[PDB]
Structure formats: C-alpha cells, structure tokens
Amino acid sequence: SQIPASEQETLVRPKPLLLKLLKSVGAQKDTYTMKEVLFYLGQYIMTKRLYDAAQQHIVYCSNDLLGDLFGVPSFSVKEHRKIYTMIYRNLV
C-alpha cells in the first residue's frame, strides 16, 4: 500500500474535463470514490493504449486529454502519491 485505504475510499467530485474522461469509458455519475476514479482512469488508459511494451510501468499520455489534465507527457504507475496529486488538481 502506498495510499491509505481511508483516502482511497473518500467520495470526490471530478471537474468537468475529468468527468468527460470518466464518462467516455462508461462511468455514469457525478461523484465517485477516489478508488473508482482510478479504476475508470485505468480503463481509459488501456482503451486508448497509452502504454508501451518497452516501458511497462509508464503511461504515455502526451497529445491526449489525460496528458492535458495531468500536465505531463508521461508518468509512472508506481508513483501513487504523485498520481493522487495529479487527480486532486482535477477534483472540485
């Protein structure tokens, strides 16, 4: 565990462009737990194939709405606090 369970289980309200992202992979609500936000972001990453076999822990999000929301061209899936911070930038 990198992120406490209690923080994972908290209800959050995505800002509009993060909501657009979640809705594009079937999410149907205005509020989600952080763990659910992460699940749908994962579904989005795998759908858009924002990954590469040469560097299997890196999300390659340049030239993608996800990159614009997170403010980076790529990031490591191992860096959970950094990911949470990037998601907090995108919550109401």
Ligand SMILES: CC(C)(O)c1cc(F)c2c(c1)C(=O)N(Cc1ccc(Cl)cn1)[C@@]2(OCC1(CO)CC1)c1ccc(Cl)cc1
């Ligand atoms: C191939 C690659 C690059 O290694 C890869 C892509 C990917 F999409 C995910 C992982 C790995 C991974 O371990 N995940 C889980 C995770 C990681 C970090 C945090 Cl803080 C929370 N959860 C990702 O989601 C995995 C799902 C949904 O649980 C099945 C689709 C995931 C979710 C969300 C984000 Cl923002 C980033 C990665």
